[PDB]
């Protein structure tokens, strides 16, 4: 017997354990779950498990790539020791403290908001979750399956879309070595054109979607302006923060008619130019961080592309925009949004 609960969870790792305020324990290796004969409500956003995950990823973010100067929007200028030694993005799992348990909605119908799940399973700890931080797309995620599915905010049109494992989507980024210390390429591999078609078909079928059913009027949409982490895709490779201009990729994946575009942006390519920045806007707190000049050598990173962060925007039945999002936190609501913490009592 139980009741919904809000209490700090304990984290568990396989290798390294300390970062900022966070300290994890060793992973026990048990990923088993037990089926229950009960109906429960689940919600990926109104969720202490994902709320805590967002905070710990933030703690990880500032200790894995060490900033030299922290500039808060308040006006404080804080200097710190910095070098080019960076921690790779880790995986960790959460574990319920004694007297508590973790429920999970084990249902393909789960879309991030489910007032009645009757395929509940219980366990003491969660799956391992990916902690990398990015905008537009999610990389190296743990939730990809042989299907496309959407976590759709129950009270908003915020979404995060899980891309189909079948299409083998990847991204290879490379900043070649020298003897261009601040500019690179990112190559998009896999069957991207079919994966996006399936995203749009999935949206059309969804009960929450009341927009056009003409998939030629459903379009991935770059934000018109704002911070660079919003107008460019934001990612990191070898401890360097990358900002990628995505016009050519959007032209290519949707096979757009580009005649109405400036000549430099008319190209349709599955690779995009990226540049390295030393000043970034922080994603969880208002501020700016300053980092050291980029390292030397050949920088290469190969990732799976597992999710697409977006708002589904329409005001009538004639056009729908899948507007690419810089809401980094949605990544972790996909990673653990099917869990609920309850007090065994």
């Amino acid at each position, epitope marked *: 017997a139980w009741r919904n609960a809000t209490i700090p969870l304990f984290c568990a790792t396989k290798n390294r354990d300390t970062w900022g305020t966070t300290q994890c324990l060793p992973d026990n290796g048990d990923y088993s779950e037990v089926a229950l004969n009960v109906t429960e409500s689940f919600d990926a956003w109104n969720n202490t498990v994902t709320e805590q995950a967002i905070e710990d990823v933030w703690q990880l973010f500032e200790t894995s790539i060490k900033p030299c100067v922290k500039l808060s929007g308040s006006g404080s200028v804080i200097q710190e020791s910095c070098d080019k030694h960076y921690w790779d993005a880790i995986r960790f799992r959460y574990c319920a403290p004694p007297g508590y348990a973790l429920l999970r909605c084990n249902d393909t119908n789960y879309s991030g908001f489910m007032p009645k799940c*009757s395929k509940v399973v219980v366990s003491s700890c969660t799956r391992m979750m990916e902690t990398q931080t990015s905008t537009w797309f999610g990389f190296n995620g743990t939730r990809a399956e042989n299907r496309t599915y959407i976590y759709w905010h129950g009270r908003d049109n915020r979404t995060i879309i899980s891309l189909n494992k079948y299409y083998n989507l990847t991204m290879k980024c490379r900043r070649p070595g020298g003897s261009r210390p601040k500019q690179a390429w990112c190559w998009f591999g896999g069957k991207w054109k079919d994966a996006i078609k399936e995203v749009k078909q999935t949206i059309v079928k969804h009960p929450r979607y009341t927009g056009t059913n003409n998939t030629d009027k459903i379009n991935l949409t770059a934000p018109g302006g704002g911070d660079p982490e919003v107008t460019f895709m934001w990612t990191n490779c070898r401890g360097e923060f990358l900002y990628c201009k995505m016009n050519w990729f959007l032209n290519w994946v949707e096979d757009r008619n580009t005649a109405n575009q400036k000549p430099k942006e008319q190209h349709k390519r599955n690779y995009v130019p990226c540049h390295i920045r030393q000043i970034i806007n922080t994603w969880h707190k208002v501020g700016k961080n300053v980092y050291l000049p980029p390292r030397e050598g050949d920088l290469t990173c190969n990732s799976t592309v597992t999710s697409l962060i977006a708002n589904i925007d329409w005001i009538d039945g004639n056009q729908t925009n899948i507007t690419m999002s810089a809401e980094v936190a949605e990544l972790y609501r996909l990673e653990l949004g099917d869990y609920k913490l309850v007090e065994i009592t």
Partner: antibody
Amino acid sequence: EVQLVQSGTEVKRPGESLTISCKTSGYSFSGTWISWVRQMPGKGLEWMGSIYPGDSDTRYHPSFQGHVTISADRSVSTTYLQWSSLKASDTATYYCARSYEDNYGYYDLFFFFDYWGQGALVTVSS
Amino acid sequence: DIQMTQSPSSLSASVGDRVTITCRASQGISTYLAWYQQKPGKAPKLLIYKAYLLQNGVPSRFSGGGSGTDFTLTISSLQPEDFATYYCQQHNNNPYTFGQGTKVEIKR
């Protein structure tokens, strides 16, 4: 395959009690709404009510509230429709109807019926 | 309590004709409308849901459209098996209600 198999024809008199049933198979009985639908002779379809077997949540059309009781038994994957005191006007065909299952959780937006029972003829007369 | 008004109550057509039925809601139901087919002595069969989505197995000659209050069902080329009665149903407002039916019979 999903199957909704209803009990057979019924002939009763005004004032008697009646329970008709519908046994399901081929899907998780507890995780989907299942409804009862009346079709009077030569007329259209009227939704009477529904139950979510997984937690016994029920809904009734305002015209049938208080005149019928809908229930379910998960151990035998069966839903029941019961009258306490039949009237002649209750003569009709009654359908078991399952709500669309793959609704992404939004049963209040997709409350339509993809699988139906064969129907049960119920005659009430002196 | 939303009322569904189907037009016309009856309609005659021949194999191969293009037929369209109408359904109107007493108030707006967005895109959440379903269409069923019923033949004498048999249970209803679902054809379309959410106004334009075809249930698995339904032949492609069936199509649905509309949003708000005015909806239509269209059969592009009538076949022998398509002569039956058709009901609409709003499926997002408790209590759920059906149209009173539109019968499609053969012409001669």
